[PDB]
């Protein structure tokens, strides 16, 4: 029995989904920048400088994902809010898969 109260929580989640998509785009750009450094003509020292600037950008991306998680964690959805609970779980699993990809980059550079 779909409620208007649930639509407010779904709206909250929709805003957070957009925010997740935008941070996801940054991650893709950082992956493309990483390929750039790997495939380019930078010498050892400048490669080290470039990957560290990228390390800072990947830590920022992780922090943005952690703050998304922290916003989602303010939600309280009763059992009846099935659509909200499923969207919330899907969004959290999506961010965790993105954080795992951030870690793959972050743990292995600079």
């Amino acid at each position: 029995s779909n409620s208007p109260q649930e639509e407010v929580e779904l709206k909250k989640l929709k805003h957070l989904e957009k925010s997740v998509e935008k941070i996801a785009d940054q991650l893709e750009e950082l992956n493309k920048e990483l390929t750039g450094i790997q495939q380019g003509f930078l010498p050892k020292d400048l490669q080290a400088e470039a990957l560290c600037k990228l390390d800072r950008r990947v830590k920022a991306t992780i922090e943005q994902f952690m703050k998304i998680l922290e916003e989602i964690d303010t939600l309280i959805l009763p059992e009846n809010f099935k659509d909200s609970r499923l969207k919330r779980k899907g969004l959290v699993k999506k961010v965790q898969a993105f954080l795992a990809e951030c870690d793959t980059v972050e743990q292995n550079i600079c």
Binding site: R56, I72, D73, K89, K93, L99
Partner: protein, 378 residues
């Protein structure tokens, strides 16, 4: 522009102005009435307040905070020596004076604590300027009562560097007493107890106001006690509960501990006006959803020693001041953690049911009193 009152805090700073017969606590660029006392240095720029705090994960070594713990101190000082192990930023010795060593705009730069505090003060000045739409030069800046002359002078110097004309430097418990107009009361000498509990430090001061003269009779407290410790106990409680229910240890994962910690601080705030708080964290650890709740009674039990522990400094302050608790005319609450009902109950019960001055936001009371003082000196 008018004159403002600035509470230069260890972790958070606050600016207020007296206008139209009232005190306005000025919100910053992020809509926050309090600004973190944080400064960050990068390849091309300097960040102050919220911006600096948020960028800390990215720039931990170059993000400076806690300058109030170093200002006016010698390198050899117990507080400076004890604290640096924790601080991600380097603390060096420049002829007996601590400096914060940071990498800034492609060079290694060293800043004195007053230069760091001047950057925070510059932001507080800007906060007031954007609200008032006028240049702000005059300010009253608060300092802790136990501050020595060197510490007091260093704070005044941070003002001068920030472009401020420091009208007066006043004690934090004096500012909190001015906020409640305790000096305007009629009768004999008035013994006032200021109970100040924030996020990291606890300060108890007893003052005697006789014919408008403020005399600090005694100071006591705990340098490392506050709301963070209350969060810690809540975290211990949840980690234990997660262990009981799922037989898994979440402490292994620092991102799981952080999500739980952030939810704990928020649940604690709910427990100041409600007797129960609920938490829902999806896929917290090893894909397990943690849905739980805590009662105010349970939160109190978890922190029973810490809450009770707040009376020891109170008994000590009474002792140094040679006073009986029945001699305390007024009790002022300062700091965000004084919003805790149990803490309020302990303090009232200790003073035989005396009412507490808590009407002004505890986090803003010091800024409030300094805004009243700044107005008087204009």
């Amino acid at each position: 522009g008018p004159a403002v009152g600035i509470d230069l805090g260890t972790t958070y700073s606050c600016v207020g102005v007296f206008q139209h017969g009232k005190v306005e606590i000025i919100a910053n660029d992020q809509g926050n009435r309090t600004t973190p006392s944080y400064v960050a240095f990068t390849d091309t720029e300097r960040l102050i307040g919220d911006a600096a705090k948020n960028q800390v994960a990215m720039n931990p070594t170059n993000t400076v905070f806690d300058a109030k713990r170093l200002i006016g101190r010698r390198f050899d000082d117990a507080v400076v020596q004890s604290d640096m192990k924790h601080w991600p930023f380097m603390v060096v010795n420049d002829a007996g004076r601590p400096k914060v060593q940071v990498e800034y705009k492609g060079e290694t730069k060293s800043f004195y604590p007053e230069e760091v505090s001047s950057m925070v003060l510059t932001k507080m000045k800007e906060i007031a300027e954007a609200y008032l739409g006028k240049t702000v030069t005059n300010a009253v800046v608060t300092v802790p009562a136990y501050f020595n002359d060197s510490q007091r002078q260093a704070t005044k110097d941070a003002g001068t560097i920030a472009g401020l004309n420091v009208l007066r430097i006043i004690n934090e418990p004096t500012a909190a007493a001015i906020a409640y107009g305790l000096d305007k009361k009629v009768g004999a000498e008035r013994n006032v107890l200021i109970f100040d509990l924030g996020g990291g430090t606890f300060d108890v001061s007893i003052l005697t106001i006789e014919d408008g003269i403020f005399e600090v009779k005694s100071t006591a407290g705990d340098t490392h006690l506050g709301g963070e410790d209350f969060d810690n106990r809540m975290v211990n409680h949840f980690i234990a509960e997660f262990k009981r229910k799922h037989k898994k240890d979440i402490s292994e994962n620092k991102r799981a501990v952080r999500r739980l910690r952030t939810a704990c601080e928020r649940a604690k705030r709910t427990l100041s006006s409600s007797t129960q708080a609920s938490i829902e964290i999806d896929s917290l650890y090893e894909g397990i959803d943690f849905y739980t709740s805590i009662t105010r009674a349970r939160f109190e039990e978890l922190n029973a020693d810490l809450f009770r522990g707040t009376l020891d400094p109170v008994e000590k302050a009474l002792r140094d001041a040679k006073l009986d608790k029945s001699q305390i005319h007024d009790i002022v609450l300062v700091g965000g953690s004084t919003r805790i009902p149990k803490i309020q109950k302990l303090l009232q019960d200790f003073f035989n049911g005396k009412e507490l001055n808590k009407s002004i936001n505890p986090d803003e009371a010091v800024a409030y009193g300094a805004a009243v003082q700044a107005a008087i000196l204009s």
